[PDB]
Design a binder for this molecule. Sequence first.
Ligand code: HEM
Length: 82
Amino acid sequence: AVKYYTLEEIQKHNNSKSTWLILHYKVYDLTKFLEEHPGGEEHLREQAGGDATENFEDVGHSTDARELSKTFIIGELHPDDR
Ligand code: HEM
């Protein structure tokens, strides 16, 4: 099951450290995808450390990517943060 991560924790993950984000309350860790993703690292890192839901959706995404997102997630932003 998900362990949750407070935005305090999420805030620590936005560098070589690791790159987290929040898409739809769900927390992400994408520190390698930084390499592969057509956005580049910069454009994930830019958002990274939480809430990238708006950028993710304004750009928006395919099913493929939403499915990928499951194996890029680590859990949720905690309910004591939402
Ligand atoms: C959860 C991790 C994500 C995955 C699996 C992912 C996957 C992909 C894939 C497969 C594409 C091609 C378009 C498609 O068919 O969806 C793409 C394009 C793109 N992604 Fe992501 N992405 C993720 C998160 C993000 C986030 C949070 C951002 C930054 C705000 C972002 C920015 C972009 C941009 C800029 C494009 C191309 C837009 C254009 O065509 O100009 N992505 N991504």
